[PDB]
């Protein structure tokens with residue numbers, strides 16, 4: 055409990071702040087010398103991901119955007135708004151990388167980000183719900199939007215990426231498989247965590263999310279920005 | 290006979306001038322806005338191939354730089370110095386594109402370019418020769434140097450390029466095959482043309498060299514420049 059406010063999870067919120075900074079700085083340092091046209095677009099977008107994330111973690115660290123929601127079980131919970139505002143801007147940027155990688159139309163991209171934004175906001179509403187029946191409704195509403203995200207990713211984007219070269223479609227697939235597995239752990243951890251079953255306390259959960267967040271931002275970013283697939287001057 | 294100067298092959302040299310110029314401009318236009326630093330290097334090198342050829346083809350059109358050679362048989366021939374000047378500076382540049390893709394070292398490049406220059410120079414010495422024995426001796430030597438170039442591509446360069454990404458490796462192999470088929474045609478066209486057995490007249494020979502030159506420069510250049518293999522470093 056670094057800030058001595060009863061929340062020993064700030065331990066994780068801190069490491070996450072740093073780790074996200076390091077990833078951000080690493081991407082910038084590495085993108086500094088890139089001249090390739092399209093490659094520079096991917097960097098700009100991806101740099102913002104851990105960038106925005108480290109700023110949301112610093113806030114959660116100082117416990118800047120948290121409120122309480124006393125459940126019906128008498129046990130009150132503290133909800134971090136920054137976490138959701140983070141995912142609200144970050145997940146759309148990661149999806150953009152994939153959209154750019156697949157070369158899909160602007161209409162499909164708008165729908166993609168839309169359902170994705172709907173996923174985070176509903177997940178927010180649920181977290182803020184008092185009864186376990188309400189939290190499941192909002193959770194189902196959110197997991198559905200997520201399945202839709204996965205759907206446009208595994209059909210539209212993928213079939214469009216299929217038309218690109220092997221180099222590009224090989225990375226799209228890799229990153230789309232990563233997203234499919236990695237992102238699926240969020241609804242799970244959420245429902246088994248403090249918002250659902252409670253098999254995990256506020257501590258370990260915060261640590262698990264941080265590990266997922268970093269892998270989904272710095273790890274994803276590393277695999278993408280490190281490949282030739284972002285290279286492009288087109289036709 | 291465009292210049293109406295008793296030589297109708299000018300019809301093929303004029304067309305070659307245009308296609309060489311057109312290709313040079315398409316390459317500049319397509320590369321001007323490319324920011325990929327490494328891709329900009331391939332463009333610079335390549336633009337000069339049809340560029341230098343354009344000039345060489347214009348010179349030959351107006352009959353600049355030509356010299357007569359009376360064979361021992363009595364027959365006399367016109368030797369367009371400009372053709373060998375073109376090749377002398379052009380084949381090395383094409384070879385450089387390949388060296389770049391493969392990422393071979395500077396020494397290899399050096400012996401590669403050196404052997405290519407020998408090939409052109411000895412070929413020109415054959416063209417200026419007075420006897421079939423002298424002409425075919427240099428032709429043979431020049432052809433052996435060609436085989437040396439071919440050997441470097443199929444072994445050293447090809448080996449080094451295999452160490453690179455699939456995309457790079459793929460484009461290198463395609464272009465190397467293109468050289469193996471296109472370049473092989475020059476010695477053959479020379480030996481069966483007015484410089485050799487004389488089965489083909491000066492008119493067709495020029496038509497054939499024009500086709501070969503444009504494919505080997507603009508064609509080759511197009512395949513390279515539109516590939517993802519010149520991206521990144």
Ligand SMILES: CCCCCCCCCO[C@@H]1O[C@H](CO)[C@@H](O)[C@H](O)[C@H]1O
Pocket residue numbers: 079082083084086087
């Ligand atoms: C906290 C870290 C902040 C980022 C630091 C600035 C990044 C410096 C990276 O060096 C760059 O390397 C390129 C070649 O790779 C050169 O072409 C370029 O000119 C040079 O500037």
Ligand SMILES: CCCCCCCCCO[C@@H]1O[C@H](CO)[C@@H](O)[C@H](O)[C@H]1O
Pocket residue numbers: 125126127128129184185186187188189190191193245249250251252
């Ligand atoms: C909502 C998503 C579906 C998950 C359902 C998990 C099983 C039901 C858990 O109910 C209980 O609810 C209380 C608040 O009402 C909590 O204080 C208590 O720890 C929790 O055990």
Ligand SMILES: CCCCCCCCCO[C@@H]1O[C@H](CO)[C@@H](O)[C@H](O)[C@H]1O
Pocket residue numbers: 161162165169172195198199202
């Ligand atoms: C609970 C979460 C609900 C999420 C609902 C998301 C709906 C997204 C709409 O997509 C659009 O549907 C059109 C047909 O109606 C298609 O012609 C168009 O191409 C497609 O982009």
Ligand SMILES: CCCCCCCCCO[C@@H]1O[C@H](CO)[C@@H](O)[C@H](O)[C@H]1O
Pocket residue numbers: 353354355370371374
């Ligand atoms: C390293 C060697 C580089 C050589 C460069 C070749 C330049 C081309 C010059 O061609 C010259 O054109 C003259 C007519 O204008 C002819 O009278 C002369 O005989 C002929 O040679």
Ligand SMILES: CCCCCCCCCO[C@@H]1O[C@H](CO)[C@@H](O)[C@H](O)[C@H]1O
Pocket residue numbers: 414417418419
């Ligand atoms: C670095 C070494 C380069 C060697 C190049 C070979 C040059 C051979 C020149 O032969 C000469 O050709 C003349 C016609 O052009 C003949 O009239 C003359 O009788 C004959 O002797």
Ligand SMILES: CCCCCCCCCO[C@@H]1O[C@H](CO)[C@@H](O)[C@H](O)[C@H]1O
Pocket residue numbers: 420421422423425426429
């Ligand atoms: C290893 C180098 C080999 C070079 C071979 C080139 C041979 C060119 C043909 O020459 C000709 O041979 C005839 C006899 O067969 C002579 O009667 C004739 O006068 C002579 O001009």
Ligand SMILES: CCCCCCCCCO[C@@H]1O[C@H](CO)[C@@H](O)[C@H](O)[C@H]1O
Pocket residue numbers: 429
């Ligand atoms: C190290 C590689 C060497 C390449 C060898 C090429 C040898 C070419 C020999 O040509 C010979 O020319 C004679 C006239 O001069 C003809 O009478 C004879 O029938 C013909 O066969």
Ligand SMILES: CCCCCCCCCO[C@@H]1O[C@H](CO)[C@@H](O)[C@H](O)[C@H]1O
Pocket residue numbers: 432435436473476477480481486488
């Ligand atoms: C690096 C590739 C080297 C290829 C060498 C092959 C040389 C073949 C030259 O022989 C010629 O073949 C013509 C038919 O094609 C005949 O009409 C002609 O009388 C004969 O002299």
Ligand SMILES: CCCCCCCCCO[C@@H]1O[C@H](CO)[C@@H](O)[C@H](O)[C@H]1O
Pocket residue numbers: 470473474
């Ligand atoms: C390195 C391999 C090079 C292979 C070159 C093959 C050239 C074939 C040219 O065929 C020509 O087609 C004309 C119709 O288009 C006919 O009128 C003409 O009589 C016929 O000779």
Ligand SMILES: CCCCCCCCCO[C@@H]1O[C@H](CO)[C@@H](O)[C@H](O)[C@H]1O
Pocket residue numbers: 421425426429480485486487
């Ligand atoms: C090792 C190098 C081998 C080169 C072989 C090329 C041989 C070319 C054959 O000579 C040509 O034969 C014609 C008749 O068929 C003659 O009309 C012509 O005047 C003569 O030049």
Ligand SMILES: CCCCCCCCCO[C@@H]1O[C@H](CO)[C@@H](O)[C@H](O)[C@H]1O
Pocket residue numbers: 470471493496497500501
């Ligand atoms: C990849 C293989 C490329 C082969 C290119 C060959 C050059 C183009 C054709 O030139 C000439 O056309 C004449 C008809 O117009 C034919 O009678 C003559 O025999 C042929 O030589």
Ligand SMILES: CCCCCCCCCO[C@@H]1O[C@H](CO)[C@@H](O)[C@H](O)[C@H]1O
Pocket residue numbers: 500504
């Ligand atoms: C790289 C691919 C090369 C493919 C070869 C294409 C050869 C096209 C020849 O066309 C025409 O043939 C007539 C004779 O039939 C000539 O009288 C006429 O002048 C010529 O223009």
Ligand SMILES: *C/C=C(C)/C=C/C=C(C)/C=C/C1=C(C)CCCC1(C)C
Pocket residue numbers: 141144145173174177178193196197198200237238240241244267270271
């Ligand atoms: C950098 C952060 C990332 C990639 C966050 C991803 C978050 C999700 C995929 C969240 C999904 C959720 C549901 C499907 C329902 C339950 C609530 C959420 C918000 C955890």
Ligand SMILES: *C/C=C(C)/C=C/C=C(C)/C=C/C1=C(C)CCCC1(C)C
Pocket residue numbers: 376379380383408409412413428429431432433435472473475476479502505506
């Ligand atoms: C743009 C022009 C190119 C790629 C020219 C290539 C020329 C050759 C490979 C020439 C080879 C020759 C011999 C092997 C011997 C006979 C004389 C030459 C110069 C025609």
